Ligand binder design. Structure first.
Ligand code: GNP
Ligand code: CA
Ligand code: CA
Ligand code: MG
Ligand code: MG
Length: 166
């Protein structure tokens, strides 16, 4: 069957692990344990296609983000995550988008922009601000909550549908 290699990137603490774990394991991780590099694999049906999702959960902390560059190389699509209550994480999306272009050596890489923690009310990144960034990249913007599951499946499945357009 088809295997989709997804890579989740973004600043420390934005919810990359919580998103992946909600998708794969159907529970919310409340605690904050910084990731080095973890992998998840699950067979799913997406739009009638039996798929294997291979998901790489990467480090957002600079301290633990050593061999990030090497493990991202095989990625077929990237979830670029920021948190809607963390303006700096939004501003830093460009650093990831540019690192992605490097490891893939292409200007046309399947990507989805994700604004996570949308259950929170201390919002400092407005939807329209993120829509504009996504539009500049020619990619979708989707908001998610790893806590409530809002948008979680839609974000990962949208990334698969972006990979299929390339
Ligand atoms: N309210 C709320 N909290 C969230 C959400 N997603 C993650 N969190 C919280 O934010 C903290 C960090 O989440 P985590 O998934 O570990 O972040 P990360 O991006 O993987 N961090 P790292 O890059 O260091 O591995 C945790 O306390 C987690 O419960 C969300 O959608 N809503
Ligand atoms: Ca593949
Ligand atoms: Ca812990
Ligand atoms: Mg993590
Ligand atoms: Mg503002």
């Amino acid at each position: 069957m088809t295997e989709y290699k997804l890579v989740v990137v973004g600043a420390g603490g934005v919810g990359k692990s919580a998103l992946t774990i909600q998708l794969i394991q159907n529970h919310f991780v409340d605690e904050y344990d910084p990731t080095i590099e973890d992998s998840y694999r699950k067979q799913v049906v997406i739009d009638g296609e039996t798929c294997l999702l291979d998901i790489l959960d990467t480090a957002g902390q600079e301290e633990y983000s050593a061999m990030r560059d090497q493990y991202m190389r095989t990625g077929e699509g990237f979830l670029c995550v920021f948190a809607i209550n963390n303006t700096k994480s939004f501003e830093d999306i460009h650093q990831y988008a540019e690192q992605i272009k490097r490891v893939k050596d292409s200007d046309d890489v399947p990507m989805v922009l994700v604004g996570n923690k949308c259950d929170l009310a201390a919002r400092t990144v407005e939807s329209r601000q993120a829509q504009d960034l996504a539009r500049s990249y020619g990619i979708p913007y989707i908001e998610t909550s790893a806590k409530t599951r809002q948008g979680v499946e839609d974000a990962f499945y949208t990334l698969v549908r972006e990979i299929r357009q390339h």
